């Protein structure tokens, strides 16, 4: 049940709720105040989902939806069977995230480490609440919303996409498709490059950090070093999930007319909106 | 048809796949033990990988991993209940004993070399041509601890040559002995570079280097243990 | 506010480093070129020296080449007026050789020659930049990960606008040269073969891709969280495990039951973005050849 190398590491100390009463493990896994109100939330959200099941009829994992209430209720409450039980998984689902970005708080005031992984993770917490609270609240109505199913929620994508005509062109959009494609490709170097060097040709030695910023020196007459691609990744990804909740924050509030028209402000900019030729003229 | 076919070999793949990775990231720590080191009954579903062998640079030998696992130094914690899964407390001073968030682990004592063979890390004094290019220099500076005491003033910039980078800041007490404390651990004022992890009178109580103008894998995890370990233990003196 | 290790407090400049030798002709490596104090708060400060072989400018000219063939084309459009030029930019666009022509070069260049043009010099832009991925690794005697890594984005690539087309017997079946219309190609597609969500591949593509994304902001943050013990040291680190591997490793263990190696969390890394492209490009290949349909498909798997 423990690494190696663990123990030591297993102290009192840390909490910031409770003092030493969730003070400890399961197996591997810490516990903690926030690690109850984790499985709370948790187990509370996935029985409503079992209920919200029995009053649609499957449990079809790929049938099963749980859907926000229709317009019609506005922002205000609705019956369970057609609003309410999304309503409140919502609620659960949002204290389940938030708890566990705590928790990780916790694990790493007792571990001596910074706090940059709970703050990147509360960048999708953000995300999320976006979709489901911020945007909604905005509009009008939770209908608005995305609803829980495997494939229903794919359908709010491409119905609630189209609704704009060809959401290629949200400018917004456009930027964070960019730093997602650019995310992963500097993943696959980073990966790439750590694996050459410790993993080198036939029964050469085990090549060192000097190598790796030459190799790509060689290759595109630059490189970043060891801190800053860790700092790259860390900045790609969550620049890729800032824009994203952007792209959806503007759509439907401030902009809500097809998304390629937006793009006309600057072709009829009065210095060449008339001149002839062209695609637009 | 072919497109079922291919999903289905894709699922197959993945697995493996899964499975290489996941044996793969047992080759530290491992097996598993109990909480008085004899080896734990219950290892999970995969297997220990075949051991592997690096072949390090600069003559410094051999690493075949998965190997023997032993901390190789005395743990000074203590169970605090009769069953698996609670915290082990300090039987002494934390920072002290190296417990905790204050935990080092015998590496080598020997420094990190660069590609070339020389020393990773060196004073600036002793790094010919290397300079403050940017940012305010610290060196001259006095160092505040989380009591809103002086400890030191700092007296050189240890860098890594290979990064061009600022790692450690050599800093000089009462004494007139120095210390090194981390660049990650500090932050560099205009007028005093301030410590948040450590009080003045912890300073002392920083693991010396045995030679003034290199650092050791094993020094450096024991400075930067004590430090760390500070934001824990040192937190009776902070605010 | 402790520090937290995004932006550095304190650059340091040295001599210039003109990297390690082993088996690279330096007769090929240029010169140092400055320094960027703009960059070094990120990362390295030194724009030094890139290595220009034989591969590298054949490289160069194909991509200058490629990318000067449909600019000439974008000002043929733009009836060469500089103002019209700018205001149609994403508009433009080199569309390939209609259906007609099928898999011929007899296409005439106002009608998708040029686009066959472009797309030659392309082609050897990227295979000899490959090419120039593997040497300069074998040059270092590094292990061939990058070129593998690379051949895998490579495969998406080559499926959109080669394999694919020929297996359609058409170039009419690749993507056009062109901001907007390159995008507008992308919707069409999915609209014509009963829409790409139905994709068991395009969903597993979109999962890599999330899980990249995912990956790198726990990595990143972690090597972040233990950089006060020199985590970023990482090949040092797998030949020596230190305290900031264990607590790496002792935080996720904490959080989900499981973790990885400093080593291992890069096989992870590297697999994870690899299988972006790789299942991508199954998906689109089999598109329109033994699939024509997604949700045709999808209601009886054959
Ligand atoms: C899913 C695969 C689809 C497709 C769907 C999309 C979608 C959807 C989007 C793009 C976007 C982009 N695509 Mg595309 N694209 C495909 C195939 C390609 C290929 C190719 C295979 O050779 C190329 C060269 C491009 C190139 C491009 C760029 C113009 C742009 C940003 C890419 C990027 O971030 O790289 C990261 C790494 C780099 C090293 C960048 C270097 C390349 C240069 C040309 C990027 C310039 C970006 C620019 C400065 C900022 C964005 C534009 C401004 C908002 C005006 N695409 C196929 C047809 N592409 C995004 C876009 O913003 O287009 C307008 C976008 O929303
Ligand atoms: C993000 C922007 C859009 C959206 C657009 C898409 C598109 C487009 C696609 C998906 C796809 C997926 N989406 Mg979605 N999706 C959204 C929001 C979510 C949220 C949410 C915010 O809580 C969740 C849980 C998911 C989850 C999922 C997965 C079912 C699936 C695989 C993606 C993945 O690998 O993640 C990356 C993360 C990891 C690899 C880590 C592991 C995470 C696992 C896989 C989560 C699965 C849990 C799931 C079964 C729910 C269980 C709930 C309770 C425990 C019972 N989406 C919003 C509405 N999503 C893809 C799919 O395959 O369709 C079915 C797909 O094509
Ligand atoms: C037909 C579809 C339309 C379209 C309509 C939309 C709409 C509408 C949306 C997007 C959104 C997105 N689009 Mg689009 N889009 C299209 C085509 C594209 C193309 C392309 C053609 O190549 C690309 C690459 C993209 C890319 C993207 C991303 C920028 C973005 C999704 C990432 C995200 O938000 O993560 C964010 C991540 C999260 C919300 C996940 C949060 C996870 C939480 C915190 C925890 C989950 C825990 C889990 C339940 C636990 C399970 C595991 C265990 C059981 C414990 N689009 C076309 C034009 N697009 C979405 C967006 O931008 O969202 C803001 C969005 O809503
Ligand atoms: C209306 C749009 C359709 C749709 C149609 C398509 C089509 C069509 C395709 C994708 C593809 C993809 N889509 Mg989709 N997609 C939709 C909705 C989504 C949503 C969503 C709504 O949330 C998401 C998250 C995605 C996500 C994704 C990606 C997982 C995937 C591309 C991976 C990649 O990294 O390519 C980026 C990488 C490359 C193109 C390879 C680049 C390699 C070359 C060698 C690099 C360029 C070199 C060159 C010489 C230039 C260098 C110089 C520079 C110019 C400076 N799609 C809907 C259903 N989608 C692709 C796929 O993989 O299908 C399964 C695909 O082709
Ligand atoms: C910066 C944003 C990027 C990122 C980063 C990120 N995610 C993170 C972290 C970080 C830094 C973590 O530390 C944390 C982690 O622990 O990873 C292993 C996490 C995490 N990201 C996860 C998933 C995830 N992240 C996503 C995206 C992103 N995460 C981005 C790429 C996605 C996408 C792309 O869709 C998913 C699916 C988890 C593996 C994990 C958080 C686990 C957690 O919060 O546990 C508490 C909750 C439960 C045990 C279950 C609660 C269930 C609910 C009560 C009911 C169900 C509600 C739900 C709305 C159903 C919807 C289902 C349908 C839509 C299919
Ligand atoms: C698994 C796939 C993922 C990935 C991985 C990946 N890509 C890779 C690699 C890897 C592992 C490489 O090793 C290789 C690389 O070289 O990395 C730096 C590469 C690469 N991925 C690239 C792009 C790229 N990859 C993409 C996507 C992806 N790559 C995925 C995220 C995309 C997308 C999102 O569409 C793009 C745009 C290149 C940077 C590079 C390959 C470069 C190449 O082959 O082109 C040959 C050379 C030329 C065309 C030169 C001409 C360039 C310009 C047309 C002219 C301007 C330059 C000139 C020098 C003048 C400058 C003047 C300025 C004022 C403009
Ligand atoms: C540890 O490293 C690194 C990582 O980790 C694995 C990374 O992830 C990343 C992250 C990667 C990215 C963000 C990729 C983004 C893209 C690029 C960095 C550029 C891509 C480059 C190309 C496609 C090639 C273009 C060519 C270049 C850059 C070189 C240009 C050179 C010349 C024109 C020749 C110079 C000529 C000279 C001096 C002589 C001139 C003579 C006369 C006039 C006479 C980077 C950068 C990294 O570095
Ligand atoms: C260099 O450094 C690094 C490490 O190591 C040195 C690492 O390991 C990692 C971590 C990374 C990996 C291991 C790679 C693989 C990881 C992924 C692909 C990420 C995606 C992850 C998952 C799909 C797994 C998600 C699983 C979860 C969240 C666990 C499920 C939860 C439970 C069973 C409940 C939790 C229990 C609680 C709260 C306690 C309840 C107790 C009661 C008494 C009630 C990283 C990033 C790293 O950079
Ligand atoms: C400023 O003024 C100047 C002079 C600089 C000109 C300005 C330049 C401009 C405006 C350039 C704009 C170019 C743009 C925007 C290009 C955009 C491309 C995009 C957005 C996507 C590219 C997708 C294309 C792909 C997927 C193509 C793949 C091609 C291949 C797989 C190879 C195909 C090869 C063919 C058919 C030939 C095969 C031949 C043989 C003999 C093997
Ligand atoms: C979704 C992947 C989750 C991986 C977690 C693996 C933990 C295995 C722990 C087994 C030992 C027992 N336990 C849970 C009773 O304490
Ligand atoms: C279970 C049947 C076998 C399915 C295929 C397994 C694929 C394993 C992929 C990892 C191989 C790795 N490698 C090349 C480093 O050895
Ligand atoms: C995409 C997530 C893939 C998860 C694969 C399964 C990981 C669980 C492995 C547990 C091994 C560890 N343990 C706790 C027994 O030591
Ligand atoms: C259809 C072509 C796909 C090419 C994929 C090549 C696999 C490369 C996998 C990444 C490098 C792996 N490694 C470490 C096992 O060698
Ligand atoms: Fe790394």
Request: proline fraction near 6%; glycine fraction near 12%.
């Amino acid at each position: 049940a423990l690494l190696s190398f663990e123990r030591k590491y297993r102290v009192p100390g840390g909490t910031l709720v409770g003092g030493n009463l969730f003070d400890f493990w399961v197996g591997p896994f810490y516990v903690g105040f926030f690690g109850v109100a984790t499985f709370f939330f948790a187990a509370l959200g996935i029985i409503l989902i079992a209920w919200s099941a029995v009053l649609q009829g499957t449990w079809n994992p790929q049938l099963i939806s749980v859907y926000p209430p229709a317009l019609e209720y506005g922002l205000g409450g609705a019956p369970l069977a057609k609003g309410g039980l999304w309503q409140i998984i919502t609620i659960c689902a949002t204290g389940a995230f938030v708890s566990w970005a705590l928790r990780e708080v916790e694990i790493c005031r007792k571990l001596g480490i910074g706090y940059h992984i709970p703050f990147a993770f509360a960048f999708a917490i953000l995300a999320y609440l976006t979709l489901v609270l911020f945007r909604p609240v905005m509009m009008g109505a939770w209908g608005y919303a995305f609803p829980y199913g495997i494939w229903t929620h794919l359908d709010w994508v491409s119905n609630t996409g189209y609704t704009y005509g060809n959401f290629h062109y949200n400018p917004a959009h456009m930027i964070a498709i960019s730093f997602f494609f650019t995310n992963a490709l500097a993943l696959a170097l980073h990966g790439a490059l750590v694996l050459s060097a410790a993993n080198p040709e036939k029964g050469k030695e085990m090549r060192t950090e000097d190598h790796e910023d030459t190799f790509f020196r060689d290759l595109v007459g630059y490189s970043i070093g060891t801190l800053g691609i860790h700092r790259l990744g860390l900045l790609l990804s969550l620049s890729a999930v800032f824009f994203s909740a952007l792209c959806m924050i503007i759509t439907g509030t401030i902009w809500f007319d097809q998304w390629v028209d937006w793009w006309q402000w600057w072709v009829k900019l009065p210095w060449w909106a008339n001149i002839p030729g062209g695609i637009n003229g | 048809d072919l497109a079922s076919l291919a999903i289905y070999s894709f699922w197959i793949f993945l697995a493996g796949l899964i499975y290489y990775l996941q044996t793969e990231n047992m080759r530290e720590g491992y097996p598993l033990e109990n909480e008085d080191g004899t080896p734990a009954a219950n290892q999970g579903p995969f297997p220990l990988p075949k051991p592997k062998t690096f072949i390090l640079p600069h003559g410094r030998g051999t690493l075949t991993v998965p190997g023997p696992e032993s901390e190789d130094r005395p743990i000074a914690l203590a169970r605090t209940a009769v069953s698996e899964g609670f915290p082990h407390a300090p039987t002494g001073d934390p920072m002290k004993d190296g417990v905790g968030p204050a935990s080092w682990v015998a590496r080598r004592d020997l420094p990190e070399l660069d590609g070339h063979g020389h020393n990773k890390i060196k004073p600036m004094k002793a790094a010919a041509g290397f300079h403050v290019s940017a940012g305010k220099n610290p060196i001259g500076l006095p160092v505040r601890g989380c009591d809103l005491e002086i400890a030191g003033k700092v007296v050189d910039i240890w860098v890594d040559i290979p990064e061009q980078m600022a790692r450690f800041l050599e800093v000089e007490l009462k004494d007139g002995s120095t210390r090194l404390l981390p660049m990650q651990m500090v932050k560099v004022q205009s007028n005093r570079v301030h410590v948040n992890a450590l009080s003045s009178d912890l300073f002392a109580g920083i693991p010396t280097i045995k030679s003034p103008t290199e650092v050791t894998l094993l020094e450096e995890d024991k400075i930067c243990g004590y430090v760390a370990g500070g934001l824990m233990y040192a937190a009776p003196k902070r605010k | 506010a402790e520090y937290q290790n995004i932006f550095s407090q304190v650059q340091v400049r040295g001599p210039a480093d003109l990297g390690m030798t082993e088996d690279v002709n330096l007769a090929n490596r240029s010169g140092v070129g400055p320094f960027s104090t703009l960059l070094g708060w990120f990362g390295n400060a030194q724009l030094g020296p890139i290595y220009l072989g034989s591969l590298g400018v054949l490289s160069l000219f194909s991509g200058l080449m490629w990318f000067f063939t449909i600019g000439i084309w974008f000002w043929y459009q733009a009836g060469w007026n500089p103002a019209v030029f700018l205001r149609d930019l994403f508009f433009f666009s080199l569309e390939p050789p209609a259906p007609e022509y099928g898999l011929s070069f007899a296409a005439p260049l106002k009608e998708g020659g040029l686009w066959l043009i472009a797309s030659f010099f392309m082609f050897v832009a990227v295979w000899s930049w490959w090419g120039r991925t593997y040497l300069r690794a074998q040059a270092l005697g590094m292990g061939k990960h990058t070129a593998w890594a690379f051949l895998s984005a490579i495969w998406l690539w080559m499926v959109l606008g080669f394999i694919r087309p020929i297996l359609m017997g058409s170039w009419s079946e690749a993507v056009p040269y062109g901001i907007f219309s390159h995008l507008d190609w992308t919707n069409n597609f999915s609209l014509v073969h009963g829409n790409l969500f139905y994709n068991p591949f395009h969903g597993l593509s979109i999962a890599f891709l999330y899980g990249s994304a995912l990956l790198f902001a726990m990595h990143g943050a972690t090597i972040l969280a233990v950089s006060r013990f020199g985590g970023e040291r990482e090949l040092e680190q797998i030949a020596d495990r230190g305290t900031a591997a264990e607590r790496a490793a002792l935080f996720w263990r904490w959080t989900m039951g499981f973790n990885a190696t400093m080593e291992g969390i890069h096989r992870w890394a590297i697999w994870m973005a690899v299988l972006v492209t790789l299942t991508g490009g199954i998906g689109i290949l089999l598109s329109g050849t033994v699939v024509d349909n997604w949700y045709v498909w999808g209601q009886n798997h054959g």
